[PDB]
Design an enzyme around this catalytic site. Structure first.
Site, mmCIF file in Angstrom:
data_model
loop_
_atom_site.group_PDB
_atom_site.id
_atom_site.type_symbol
_atom_site.label_atom_id
_atom_site.label_comp_id
_atom_site.label_asym_id
_atom_site.label_seq_id
_atom_site.Cartn_x
_atom_site.Cartn_y
_atom_site.Cartn_z
ATOM 1 N N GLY A 101 0.345 -1.356 -0.175
ATOM 2 C CA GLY A 101 -0.073 -0.407 -0.043
ATOM 3 C C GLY A 101 0.763 0.928 0.115
ATOM 4 O O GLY A 101 0.233 2.234 0.143
ATOM 5 N N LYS A 102 2.262 1.188 -0.280
ATOM 6 C CA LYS A 102 3.013 2.128 -0.484
ATOM 7 C C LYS A 102 2.164 3.234 -1.074
ATOM 8 O O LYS A 102 2.074 4.506 -0.025
ATOM 9 C CB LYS A 102 4.310 1.856 -0.577
ATOM 10 C CG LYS A 102 4.868 0.979 0.662
ATOM 11 C CD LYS A 102 6.421 0.737 -0.025
ATOM 12 C CE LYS A 102 6.610 0.381 -1.639
ATOM 13 N NZ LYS A 102 5.942 -1.469 -1.553
ATOM 14 N N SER A 103 2.454 3.447 -2.648
ATOM 15 C CA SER A 103 1.764 4.130 -3.031
ATOM 16 C C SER A 103 0.287 4.879 -3.436
ATOM 17 O O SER A 103 0.510 6.244 -3.307
ATOM 18 C CB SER A 103 2.383 3.806 -4.449
ATOM 19 O OG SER A 103 0.867 3.052 -5.008
ATOM 20 N N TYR A 104 -0.414 4.241 -2.993
ATOM 21 C CA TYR A 104 -1.911 4.429 -2.642
ATOM 22 C C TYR A 104 -1.615 5.016 -1.075
ATOM 23 O O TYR A 104 -2.406 6.462 -1.194
ATOM 24 C CB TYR A 104 -2.487 3.461 -1.833
ATOM 25 C CG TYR A 104 -4.559 3.483 -1.639
ATOM 26 C CD1 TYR A 104 -4.757 4.013 -2.748
ATOM 27 C CD2 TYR A 104 -4.688 4.094 -0.419
ATOM 28 C CE1 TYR A 104 -6.467 3.757 -2.243
ATOM 29 C CE2 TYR A 104 -5.786 3.637 -0.487
ATOM 30 C CZ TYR A 104 -6.975 3.951 -1.786
ATOM 31 O OH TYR A 104 -7.793 4.598 -1.127
ATOM 32 N N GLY A 250 10.226 -2.182 -3.166
ATOM 33 C CA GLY A 250 9.364 -2.943 -2.659
ATOM 34 C C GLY A 250 10.430 -3.811 -1.790
ATOM 35 O O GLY A 250 11.561 -4.054 -2.111
HETATM 36 N N1 LIG Z 1 -5.698 1.694 2.567
HETATM 37 C C1 LIG Z 1 -6.023 1.073 1.079
HETATM 38 N N2 LIG Z 1 -7.041 1.127 1.235
HETATM 39 C C2 LIG Z 1 -7.855 0.897 -0.443
HETATM 40 N N3 LIG Z 1 -7.199 0.017 -1.173
HETATM 41 C C3 LIG Z 1 -5.397 0.196 -0.986
HETATM 42 C C4 LIG Z 1 -5.143 0.191 0.771
HETATM 43 N N4 LIG Z 1 -3.273 0.025 0.352
HETATM 44 C C5 LIG Z 1 -3.551 -0.242 -0.853
HETATM 45 N N5 LIG Z 1 -4.856 -0.442 -1.512
HETATM 46 C C6 LIG Z 1 -4.523 -0.982 -2.988
HETATM 47 O O1 LIG Z 1 -3.479 -1.772 -2.961
HETATM 48 C C7 LIG Z 1 -3.006 -2.038 -3.838
HETATM 49 C C8 LIG Z 1 -2.040 -1.868 -4.584
HETATM 50 O O2 LIG Z 1 -0.758 -0.798 -4.837
HETATM 51 P P1 LIG Z 1 0.053 -0.146 -3.591
HETATM 52 O O3 LIG Z 1 -0.416 -1.077 -2.360
HETATM 53 O O4 LIG Z 1 0.140 1.028 -4.073
HETATM 54 O O5 LIG Z 1 1.199 -0.851 -4.080
HETATM 55 P P2 LIG Z 1 2.987 -1.033 -2.888
HETATM 56 O O6 LIG Z 1 2.710 -0.939 -2.015
HETATM 57 O O7 LIG Z 1 3.679 -1.484 -3.868
HETATM 58 O O8 LIG Z 1 3.314 0.524 -2.950
HETATM 59 C C9 LIG Z 1 -3.571 -1.171 -5.185
HETATM 60 O O9 LIG Z 1 -4.251 -1.063 -5.715
HETATM 61 C C10 LIG Z 1 -4.130 -0.182 -4.039
HETATM 62 O O10 LIG Z 1 -5.686 0.381 -4.323
HETATM 63 MG MG LIG Z 2 3.742 2.475 -5.360
#
Ligand SMILES: Nc1ncnc2c1ncn2[C@@H]1O[C@H](COP(=O)(O)OP(=O)(O)O)[C@@H](O)[C@H]1O
Ligand SMILES: [Mg+2]
Length: 351
Positions: A101-104, A250
């Site tokens: 969820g880092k970039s979210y 990651g």
């Molecule tokens: N708190 C959250 N609520 C809803 N969706 C989430 C949340 N955290 C992560 N996601 C979802 O999880 C997926 C992973 O993207 P992300 O977690 O940003 O990647 P990373 O962790 O590699 O940065 C996406 O589809 C994102 O929308």
């Molecule tokens: Mg990301």
């Protein structure tokens, strides 16, 4: 005894990969406390961890205990922004497993209130600036956006430039990125359009199905300059705070030499020869790590049994990060002192 690194963790709903394997939830939260069950040895004592915030986002925002984009901004986003106003340099960096969820957290989606920390902090920064009614207050806002992929830096605000930009030590003022765009911005919309194009320029990888590489770090920097004009003396004093917003590679582990080094750094500072310069990232952030900065970590967590070891590792790094001391000071213009004397000198001289 100074200030310590703020540390929040956040667990998201199951993603597609987790639902495909009928993954169960192994993460539980309760106030500031996160507990993780070992689904392999379901007979082991669960391991529990205590942070500044344990955010439960495992559900939907329709639910009451769902930790929203607003809540997470308002807890650490606002705090760090307020510190920038006080004249401190600040850092928030998103740490965790690919998919966690880092970039979210840092960017969000920008569809409806899905906006992450970075876009919120830019709305709040500009919002506070334009609410100013002291006419003796004026403001400058400069943004840098870069990617570190495989120890090589690129300029996300200047894609046409293919420079593998060199990370230099200044002999007096520490590390900087040679010839990195610093773009003056005077609107939130304006800073939006730049981190928009910035994101689109990120290294894409066939391995993540041609999504942003999980091996790329994203550093978004604002140089925030506050100008106070004094009438009496007609000196202008400046507050200069640097905000570092970071979306790491990651965590699961030459071209990871950045991320493995971050670990060894965090770990050294926790037990306290620091290898800041063994990597580009720990080098550029030498100051935000154990130095002149107020710094928060937001660790993203998979709720899924299948991610147990990665998700345990994130928790143990988070928990070590909690024991880092920051020696942050206020950007001090020596001219405030000067203004105090010379004005008083003039008034007592009108007895
Ligand atoms: N708190 C959250 N609520 C809803 N969706 C989430 C949340 N955290 C992560 N996601 C979802 O999880 C997926 C992973 O993207 P992300 O977690 O940003 O990647 P990373 O962790 O590699 O940065 C996406 O589809 C994102 O929308
Ligand atoms: Mg990301």
């Amino acid at each position: 005894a100074g200030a310590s690194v703020k540390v929040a963790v956040r667990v998201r709903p199951f993603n597609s990969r987790e639902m495909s394997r009928d993954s169960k939830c192994i993460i539980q939260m309760s106030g500031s406390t996160t507990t993780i069950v070992n689904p392999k040895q379901p007979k082991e004592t669960p391991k529990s961890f205590s942070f500044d915030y344990s955010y439960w986002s495992h559900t939907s925002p329709e639910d009451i205990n769902y930790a929203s984009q607003k809540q997470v901004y308002r807890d650490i986003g606002e705090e760090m922004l307020q510190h920038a106003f006080e004249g401190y340099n600040v850092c928030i960096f998103a740490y965790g497993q690919t998919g966690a969820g880092k970039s979210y957290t840092m960017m969000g989606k920008q569809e409806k209130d899905q906006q992450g920390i970075i876009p919120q902090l830019c709305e709040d920064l500009f919002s506070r600036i334009n609410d100013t009614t002291n006419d003796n207050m004026s403001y400058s806002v400069e943004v840098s956006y870069m990617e570190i992929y495989c120890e090589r830096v690129r300029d996300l605000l200047n894609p046409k430039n293919k420079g593998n930009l060199r990370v230099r030590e200044h002999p007096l003022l520490g590390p900087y990125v040679e010839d990195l765009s610093k773009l003056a911005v005077t609107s939130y919309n304006d800073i939006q359009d730049l981190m928009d194009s910035g994101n689109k320029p990120r290294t894409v990888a066939a391995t993540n199905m041609n999504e942003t590489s999980s091996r790329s770090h994203a550093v978004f920097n604002i140089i925030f300059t506050q100008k106070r004009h004094d009438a009496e003396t007609n000196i202008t004093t400046e507050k200069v705070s640097k905000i570092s917003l970071v979306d790491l590679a990651g965590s699961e582990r030459n071209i990871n030499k950045s991320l493995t080094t971050l670990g060894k750094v965090i770990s050294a500072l926790a037990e306290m020869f620091i290898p800041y310069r063994d990597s580009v990232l720990t080098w550029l952030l030498r100051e935000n790590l154990g130095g002149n900065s107020r710094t928060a970590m937001v660790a993203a967590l998979s709720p899924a049994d299948i991610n147990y070891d990665e998700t345990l590792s994130t928790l143990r790094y988070a928990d070590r990060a909690k024991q880092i001391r920051c020696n942050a000071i206020i950007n001090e213009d020596p001219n405030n002192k000067l203004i105090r004397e010379l004005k008083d000198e003039v008034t007592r001289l009108r007895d």
